[PDB]
Amino acid sequence: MVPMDKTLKEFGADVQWDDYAQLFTLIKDGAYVKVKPGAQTAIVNGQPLALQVPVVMKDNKAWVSDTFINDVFQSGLDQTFQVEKRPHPLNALTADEIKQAVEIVKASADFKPNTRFTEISLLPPDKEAVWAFALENKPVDQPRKADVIMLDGKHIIEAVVDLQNNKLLSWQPIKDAHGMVLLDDFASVQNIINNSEEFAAAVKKRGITDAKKVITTPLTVGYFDGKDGLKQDARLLKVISYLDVGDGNYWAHPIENLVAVVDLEQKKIVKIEEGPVVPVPMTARPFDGRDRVAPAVKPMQIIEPEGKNYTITGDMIHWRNWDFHLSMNSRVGPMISTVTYNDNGTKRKVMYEGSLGGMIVPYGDPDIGWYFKAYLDSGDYGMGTLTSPIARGKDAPSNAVLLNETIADYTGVPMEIPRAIAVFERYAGPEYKHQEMGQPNVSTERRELVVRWISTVGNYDYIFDWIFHENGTIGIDAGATGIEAVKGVKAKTMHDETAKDDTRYGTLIDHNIVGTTHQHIYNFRLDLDVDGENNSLVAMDPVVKPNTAGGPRTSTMQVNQYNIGNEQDAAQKFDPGTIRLLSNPNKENRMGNPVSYQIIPYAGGTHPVAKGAQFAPDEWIYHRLSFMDKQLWVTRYHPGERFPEGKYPNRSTHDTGLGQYSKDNESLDNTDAVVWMTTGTTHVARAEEWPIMPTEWVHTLLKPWNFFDETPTLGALK
Amino acid sequence: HMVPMDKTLKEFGADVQWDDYAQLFTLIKDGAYVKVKPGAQTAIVNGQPLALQVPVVMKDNKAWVSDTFINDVFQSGLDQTFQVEKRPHPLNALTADEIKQAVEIVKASADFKPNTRFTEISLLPPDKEAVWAFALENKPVDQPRKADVIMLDGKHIIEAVVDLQNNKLLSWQPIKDAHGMVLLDDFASVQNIINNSEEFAAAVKKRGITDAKKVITTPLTVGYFDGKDGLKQDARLLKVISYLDVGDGNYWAHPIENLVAVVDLEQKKIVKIEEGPVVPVPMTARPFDGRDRVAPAVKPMQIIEPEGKNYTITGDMIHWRNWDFHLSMNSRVGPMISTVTYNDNGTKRKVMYEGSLGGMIVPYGDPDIGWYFKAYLDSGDYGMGTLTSPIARGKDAPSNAVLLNETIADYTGVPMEIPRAIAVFERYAGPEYKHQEMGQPNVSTERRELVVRWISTVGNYDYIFDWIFHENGTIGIDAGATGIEAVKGVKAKTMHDETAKDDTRYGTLIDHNIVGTTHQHIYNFRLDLDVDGENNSLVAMDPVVKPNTAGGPRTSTMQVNQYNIGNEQDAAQKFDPGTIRLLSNPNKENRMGNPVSYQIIPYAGGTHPVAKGAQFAPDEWIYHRLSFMDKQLWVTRYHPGERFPEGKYPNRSTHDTGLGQYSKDNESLDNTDAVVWMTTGTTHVARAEEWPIMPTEWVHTLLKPWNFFDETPTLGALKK
Ligand SMILES: [Ca+2]
Ligand SMILES: [Ca+2]
Ligand SMILES: [Ca+2]
Ligand SMILES: [Ca+2]
Ligand SMILES: [Cu+2]
Ligand SMILES: [Cu+2]
Ligand SMILES: [Xe]
Ligand SMILES: [Xe]
Ligand SMILES: [Xe]
Ligand SMILES: [Xe]
Ligand SMILES: [Xe]
Ligand SMILES: [Xe]
Ligand SMILES: [Xe]
Ligand SMILES: [Xe]
Ligand SMILES: [Xe]
Ligand SMILES: [Xe]
Ligand SMILES: [Xe]
């Protein structure tokens, strides 16, 4: 016998007591439990359950059998989770597979002693075999393989290991590649600064008595063809710094015009750049509420007391007509795979793999601490790795189910991220409605299934939602919050003398604090397979045309329709007044229209939209990262083309991403296509965003276009 | 005593859940969340105990209640959602009494004829300054309540004004050259005229229809075409499109193509029958109501607020967190949000004097005889408030909504209570903000939004408007479209038929013999924003890429070109979603010295392709008559009489009497009382997914505080 409230809260359930009904309600993930003290039975998700030991009330305190949690929550009356008897071949590496793969490479003599890992991931078996698993249950007959990418000092090495046979299949050094930043690089950088008298010197000049209070933040340095005076072949990071004044918000206290360049192979500062002294803003600016009181609000709950409409079977999700596989990657986070829509009995392919491709937050300011600053969060830091556990009921609604996921850390040890992903169903207005005059109304509710993931790199938090609509639409939303990267300036108000120079590149958002203008650019890789792999890309441009049919109208609304046959043409800006379809030319609906999906890389946003990259074309960043300046890309499927910024974007000299994948301008005619959507905002700051930035959203959409023969949510014919 | 619980409460509109295990009823309606056990002498209402005289009785597991149960429980007073109003707000709509009174005053005139009908009976609003002083300083309003009474005398419009405090007719003005809107009885008239026409019965026989009594008409306005339509300019005319009733409940799926009757309403006669080639009527049953579908098994989801709401509704005034505002209903534009303030640390700061739909238009792109003139001015021509669709509880709005009744005059001048006219609900909208600093505890708060939702159906589209108050000061306006598509009857069954290419020049083939004609939805919103005061300026901020003149390796920088927009003609513009447009207050600054502003975003996204302007050539009449369609943003000088982007009398208008007119003098917009108009819409190209019934599509607009506050507005009360 064990104390109920304490044990249940330790287990993650919410416990509610209703004194009028004398009834506990226990909620956790898919389980909604009702139990009265002294009763011999309980209710799990609407279903009766016999108890071995009743709940006993001793002294206004609930006690339960030590076995109650297993008997009630793992009873099988919660159907949310089902056992996976046959593993999906895209399942992520398990903890054991991660450990096995590390032993296999550590067994090589070429494995040097301080070697770190940038990625340990499933090597994807071939597409055709994976589709036949999902659609025909045909076993895949390859062994499980892992990509093991190692960073030996500054050297990158790619290995492949076979996990069934426990052998090493290849070992390829990659000359010229720089590695991504690893967690331990953060501490190194912070120690190197703590141990430089030269740095302490530099900081003393800037008014800082105590150099031990200085917080560093490490940045990749980009590539500028020697013009930043940094040699190409060293492992370098740039270091910006802030003053810890004890408000929990080092970000609010920048030490402007002071940059250290750190060589991580020498573990020393190798350059200090110093510009005008700007006094460090010092006023406490906490964002955690330590100085605040919230208003009392009344409680709101979203409850599903008979359980969920979805089923999670291992990593497979089933919900209404949708089925898909959800797996987690250390670089790009969640990946949605083998997505199909069940059209009256038949599973129809929609998307083979979908995931974040990459993202970049480049800044607009040419000064010493800014000019090179461009966060490539997934590429350079690893957004999977930096997943933020979801705060139950706040980051996601209280009817969510939260999943743990596992990936390798930089030392090769499996790391379990709790609450890495949230899945929840939500009400989203009426699905359709018609109220014919003087007739009974027709309305049905809209339901969306959301898959939500959060990653935090330095000062922003990014939120990605993959949204499945019952009617076949799929949305992808990207939200941004966190703390602005700010410049320390002399101006306190717009009336000060330096105000105008001070704000040339950003808004004054606090006294001495300027929010530097920048962009948020997200790129999604969507290997759509519209009812099969063989697809084509169709444009439909609504046009105003002279009326030629007679009568009083001078004009008409027509559609200009044409195919886009190759990769260079498919790389384009997106006009939200046009329609872009990925069609299957081999298959038609009942009316003879090619089954298609409409691609909408900009379906809206709460911040101003990027039309492309806010950079002149002669900028190195513009040259290295082509993906930034078009909204839409379509390339021929290739298992190894995965990242719009290239595989090794750190200090890269040219575009190894989407600029390379499209170089040879290949045919896109009736073939396996991969769609990439680039969507962006231009962020000009305002005081409302300081000291913490209310979440801002961009939206994208994939809508079925004559994929069905009729309203998909009408339901099956009697 | 007794009366049967389940039946009484469901009649009453409450949701009823019985929990067999807990032996407990949970009854839910609007702001009341009630728990009651059979036999208990008490019940719980929003967390408070309440004594019952008669307990809920169980007999053979039928539940029984006292015939006074409903008033005792739902009228207890433990539901605090609704409070009675202390001093009537000067913007409260006409009451049923006031409507009846206003009608008696004009009926007591010698000039009143018994055929006269009413297009509008509305509060004539007192002046803006006195209304603000009432809201902000509690100063009573000393002008008397007046009503606008707008009458249609056969084809003539008369505008009467009546004083209700003093019971008299202050004025009576015929308005020459104005046509009146379509009225509800016009629907019946047009259907009877067609049923009485032997010539129409013949036209319909030609096209396969042997039974003329199974034909359904629908009235359209005719527009203006400089005579090319062959129609008398002065007469009261409407065009009639026709459909075959086949008994599937969806006559919209069965057009009788190329048949138009023109009807003179005065004369009660068909004046002209335009015929073109014969196209066989599509006959296959296509019900949208599920008579032929399997109901899918879905598990329940409830959004519950078991201690009541965070908002209070005091008369028509709504209070929620830091917002206060006033809500009323107009027969032409529906809901109006007024005297909107944000409470900043004890000081109520002005945001918006009046906000409402201005007008809307759905113009088609097909030049054939049943199409070429077709453009629904849904509010202006039909009265969207009049056509309000009662919210379907749990479906049209979430299960935690409160549903308000509204009263407007009908066309004969009798008050009409519309049930469930507006839904108010609070909703979760993700994290308000979050930061997870590496190795520290998390910070996250939930975002909450308050939605005011109204739905209106005109013919075949159902429209859903949401006004959304974010806790942090943002205001969103979303427009949703659903219903049944206007379809053309055609000969092609599939795209393989010989006529397919021509049949689909103006629309997609969405069913056998059925084309969804391409069109646009264009919405316009009139927002009298008063950003912390009436005296505002318009500012542009265009992000630009400039050469780096500061040295270092960069070739370019990100900067902003800032300028004022000094006059109306300059303020009428396309919106580029990559730029920023602010209504500032040049007289008031935040702690940083920045003028307190709102950012106006007329296009914040949409589910359909976006309309860049009117999809018409510059020489179309519809184009000439309706300037509002081609610009996303207009700013004009406050004028109490300028309310409709399409003009006050848009039926068969020959020129622009709306935003084209309101801006034609190109007046100054420098530090003055400005009114913002947002035009936004979609180009609709149909697809099979939208037939027989169209899944709801949404467009979004946003108003965001810009340096209006000093910091993150949602941080919480400062303890330090
Ligand atoms: Ca290629
Ligand atoms: Ca593909
Ligand atoms: Ca104003
Ligand atoms: Ca004017
Ligand atoms: Cu930003
Ligand atoms: Cu439409
Ligand atoms: Xe990292
Ligand atoms: Xe799956
Ligand atoms: Xe997350
Ligand atoms: Xe970072
Ligand atoms: Xe168009
Ligand atoms: Xe494209
Ligand atoms: Xe596409
Ligand atoms: Xe009407
Ligand atoms: Xe108000
Ligand atoms: Xe209509
Ligand atoms: Xe504007």
Residue numbers in the entry:
A (entry chain A): 7 to 724
B (entry chain B): 6 to 725
Task: Pull text from the paper.
Copper amine oxidases (CuAOs) catalyse the oxidation of a wide range of amine substrates to generate a product aldehyde, ammonia and hydrogen peroxide. In bacteria, they play a role in general nitrogen catabolism. They contain a protein-derived cofactor that is generated autocatalytically by post-translation modification of a conserved endogenous tyrosine to generate 2,4,5-trihydroxylphenylalanine quinone (TPQ), requiring only the presence of copper and molecular oxygen. TPQ is situated in the core of the protein at the end of a well defined substrate-access channel next to a type II copper coordinated by three histidines. ECAO is distinct from Gram positive bacterial and yeast CuAOs in that it possesses an extra 9.3 kDa N-terminal domain, which gives ECAO a characteristic ‘mushroom stalk and cap’ shape.
Bio­chemical and structural characterization of ECAO indicate that the binding of oxygen in the active site is similar to that of the other family members; however, it is possible that the presence of the additional N-terminal domain, which is located at one end of the structurally conserved β-sandwich, could alter or provide an alternate pathway for oxygen entry. In order to investigate this possibility, we have determined the crystal structure of ECAO in complex with xenon at 2.5 Å resolution. The Xe atoms were bound in hydrophobic pockets located in either the amine substrate-entry channel or around the conserved β-sandwich oxygen-entry pathway. Nearly identical sites were observed in both subunits of ECAO present in the asymmetric unit1. Two Xe atoms are bound in the amine substrate-entry channel. Xenon 4/11 occupies a site between Tyr381 and Tyr387 that is equivalent to that previously observed in AGAO and HPAO. We did not observe any xenon-binding sites inside the lower half of the β-sandwich near the ‘bottom’ entrance to the putative oxygen-entry pathway. A final xenon, xenon –/10, is bound at the edge of ECAO in a hydrophobic pocket and is not close to any previously observed xenon position. No xenon-binding sites are observed in the ECAO N-­terminal domain itself nor does the presence of this domain appear to affect xenon binding in the lower half of the β-sandwich when compared with other CuAOs for which xenon complexes have been determined. These observations indicate that the N-terminal domain does not play a role in oxygen entry during ECAO catalysis, which is consistent with the lack of conservation of the N-terminal domain across the CuAOs.
